[PDB]
Design a protein around this ligand. Structure first.
Ligand SMILES: Cc1cc2nc3c(=O)[nH]c(=O)nc-3n(C[C@H](O)[C@H](O)[C@H](O)COP(=O)(O)OP(=O)(O)OC[C@H]3O[C@@H](n4cnc5c(N)ncnc54)[C@H](O)[C@@H]3O)c2cc1C
Ligand SMILES: NC(=O)c1ccc[n+]([C@@H]2O[C@H](COP(=O)([O-])OP(=O)(O)OC[C@H]3O[C@@H](n4cnc5c(N)ncnc54)[C@H](OP(=O)(O)O)[C@@H]3O)[C@@H](O)[C@H]2O)c1
Ligand SMILES: Cc1cc2nc3c(=O)[nH]c(=O)nc-3n(C[C@H](O)[C@H](O)[C@H](O)COP(=O)(O)O)c2cc1C
Length: 613
């Protein structure tokens, strides 16, 4: 990872006084940065965004060489309160450096989520650390809560931030407003076909010419071997997929995640085009008007609107306030121009409307286009606004020791009645479902992501796995592997599964496979919880609570490892208590002593989580 030159120097040479580093994976932090960066301009200053992984943040000490200089960090938290991948260098650095940042003015906005225990560790860290080094805080730390509404949290913060800035430095709010574009449109007519991106993510033609290694930037088109329906009932659609990675040299261990780069719904794309009156089959490119930025285009180019809407753009999520504000200009009917503008208010009714009519109603772009017919923006400007389509992750359901040449996926297809009035569909799950094992084959641009979730190294350590619904996913690989080790002579301690589902004839995933593993003995216990076969709910905690005596015997004496995968707002929290209570009873020990004991197993590597909401 060859770093770029002193960003301070670039700022000097490009007349910029504020830089906004973004630490993110799904791009939300990146978005905020770009917004905060563009914002800078309307207040007499000029800023720029930047990936800290491309620079050496050691130069912060040089930043004071620029008048009215100030750095801003938009950081998100992951894993064990860990930084985003790209924010890793920055982190390790802040920890090891002793550098003096005297004269450095900063501000930090962190993206977190209250379900997790390490709420905005990064944000809190950077803010607090930069001070210890010497830099002076120009504005309070921002704690954005995604479980509530990060967007609004950002708004509220941003709104107070600029004035503070303006005041500390004595600068004007320079009239504000009047749309400013980032890219410039360039339509191509002669464009040699063989050089137009068709949905590749990295180098031109990387999808056709597959050359390792394969990473997020160079995914590996994997053939869909099997795509079966796992649920017996019809309430929902749960599926088991098997991606063939032969000849990819891609390594992986049960507990890792695999990511996919899906394609939006054809019909949904056609309509956006149609309702705008634009020819989606036009070949074009959006070159940055700043001939200095490294981000030459909003996405791969040259390409066609259809390709961008289909593979490069997120056209299904609720548009964020700034995208709607920018569009307000393209709505002829005033009534509508107003709502759109108002969408980015910090408070008032504008806020409530953006919160219920857009977010709560899950209204995506096309929906808003249909509901505000006077809104007919230019297709090229829309693409510059829409955010980038992300890859979806999946707990690899298989074990490397048994399926080295294949990755398995257990997923629940997303589909629901939105209050917007229509039916929304999960981008990747709908895409995945439509893959028929069968150019001709069914390929899925994927790539693996290593994780922390891992079976114990020592084959005799007791494993306790709590994974209701699709939470069982990673655990299918766990059991396969522990089954293997036994067929390999290896001595295997207890292996217990604590699974859950509605009814044994609705969503009892791997009812049969799990039946085998149990019969043969691979699974010491197979405690399953049918939450709907009786008046009262029977969740997995109840089972854990039921086996308190035994579990505590492997946790406290057998040094067993606890694994938790699935829902994070409830399932995980409820389970975590039950463990507090098991420890507190059989300890014995007050709640506090127990809560700690558990959290220790958590840090001492014996209690792993892998939840989301
Ligand atoms: C580390 C990790 C591991 C994961 N492992 C798995 C796994 O093993 N199996 C699996 O199925 N998924 C897993 N996921 C979730 C997975 O990545 C996808 O989010 C999921 O498959 C749906 O993606 P989609 O693109 O089809 O849906 P999208 O189009 O992206 O839509 C999903 C979004 O729609 C919204 N939504 C969903 N239902 C409703 C509703 N009823 N009403 C209103 N809004 C709603 C939510 O905001 C949700 O985030 C994992 C995620 C992470 C981060
Ligand atoms: N981050 C990850 O790695 C990961 C992996 C898998 C799933 N998930 C997340 O979990 C959510 C749902 O997953 P899912 O569809 O697969 O599960 P699910 O089908 O919705 O539910 C599975 C089982 O859990 C039960 N349940 C509901 N509330 C519970 C509680 N408080 N304690 C214990 N069991 C409870 C259900 O019963 P009832 O419905 O009848 O109440 C059912 O028996 C999604 O939001 C998804 O993001 C995250
Ligand atoms: C796998 C995963 C792990 C997360 N872990 C944490 C965490 O430990 N602490 C926290 O405060 N937020 C956590 N979050 C929430 C994110 O910090 C939040 O969604 C943020 O907006 C992500 O930023 P991005 O879009 O810029 O990548 C996690 C999200 C995911 C999907």
């Amino acid at each position: 990872p060859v770093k770029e030159s002193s960003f301070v120097e670039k700022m000097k040479k490009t007349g910029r006084n504020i830089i906004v580093f973004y630490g993110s994976q799904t791009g939300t932090a990146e978005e905020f940065a770009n917004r905060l960066s563009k914002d800078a301009h309307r207040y007499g200053m000029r800023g720029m965004s930047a990936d800290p992984e491309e620079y050496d943040l050691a130069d912060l000490s040089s930043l004071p060489e620029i008048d009215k200089s100030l750095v801003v960090f938009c950081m998100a938290t992951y894993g064990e309160g860990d930084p985003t991948d790209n924010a890793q260098d920055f982190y390790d650095w802040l920890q090891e450096t002793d550098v003096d940042l005297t004269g450095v003015k900063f501000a930090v906005f962190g993206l977190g989520n209250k379900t997790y225990e390490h709420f905005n560790a990064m944000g809190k860290y950077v803010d607090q650390r930069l001070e210890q080094l010497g830099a002076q805080r120009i504005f309070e730390l921002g704690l954005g809560d995604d479980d509530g509404n990060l967007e609004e949290d950002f708004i509220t913060w941003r709104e107070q931030f600029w004035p503070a800035v303006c005041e500390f430095f004595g600068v004007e709010a320079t009239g504000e407003e009047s749309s400013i574009r980032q890219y410039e449109l360039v339509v191509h007519e002669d464009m040699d076909v063989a050089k137009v991106y068709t949905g590749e993510m990295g180098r031109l033609k990387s999808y056709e010419n597959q050359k390792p290694p394969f990473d997020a930037k160079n995914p590996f088109l994997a053939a869909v071997t099997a795509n079966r329906k796992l649920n017996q009932g019809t309430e929902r659609h749960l599926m088991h997929l098997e991606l063939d990675i032969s000849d990819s040299k891609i390594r992986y261990e049960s507990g890792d995640h695999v990511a996919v780069y899906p394609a939006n719904d054809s019909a949904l794309v056609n309509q956006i085009g149609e309702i705008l009156g634009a020819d989606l089959d036009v070949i074009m490119s959006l070159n940055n008007l700043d001939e200095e930025s490294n981000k030459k285009h909003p996405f791969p180019c040259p390409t066609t609107y259809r390709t961008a809407l289909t593979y490069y753009l997120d056209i299904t999520n609720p548009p964020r306030t700034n995208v709607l504000y920018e569009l307000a200009q393209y709505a002829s009917e005033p009534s509508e121009q107003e709502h759109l503008h108002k969408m980015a208010s910090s408070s008032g009714e504008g806020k409530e409307l953006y919160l219920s009519w857009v977010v709560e109603a899950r209204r995506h772009i096309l929906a808003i286009l249909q509901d505000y017919p006077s809104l007919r923006p230019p297709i090229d400007h829309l693409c510059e606004l829409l955010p980038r389509l992300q890859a979806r992750y999946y707990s690899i359901a298989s074990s490397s020791k048994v399926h080295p040449n294949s990755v398995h996926i257990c997923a629940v297809a997303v589909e629901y009645e939105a209050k917007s009035g229509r039916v929304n569909k999960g981008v990747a799950t709908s895409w995945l479902r439509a893959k028929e094992p069968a150019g001709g084959r069914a390929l899925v641009p994927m790539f693996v992501r290593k994780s922390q979730f891992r079976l114990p190294f020592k084959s005799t350590t007791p494993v306790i796995m709590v994974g209701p619904g699709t939470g069982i996913a990673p655990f299918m690989g766990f059991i396969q592997e522990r089954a293997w080790l036994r067929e390999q002579g290896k001595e295997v301690g207890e292996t217990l599964l604590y699974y859950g589902c509605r009814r044994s004839d609705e969503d009892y995933l791997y009812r049969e496979e799990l039946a085998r593993f149990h019969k043969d003995g691979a699974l010491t216990q197979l405690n399953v919880a049918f939450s709907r076969e009786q008046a009262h709910k029977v969740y997995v905690q109840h089972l854990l609570k039921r086996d308190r005596e035994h579990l505590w015997k492997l946790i406290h004496e057998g040094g067993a490892h606890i694994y938790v995968c699935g829902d994070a707002r409830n399932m995980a929290k409820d389970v975590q208590n039950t463990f507090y209570d098991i420890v507190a009873e059989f300890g014995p020990m007050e709640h506090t002593q127990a809560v700690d004991y558990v959290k220790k197993l958590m840090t001492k590597g014996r209690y792993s989580l892998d939840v989301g909401s």
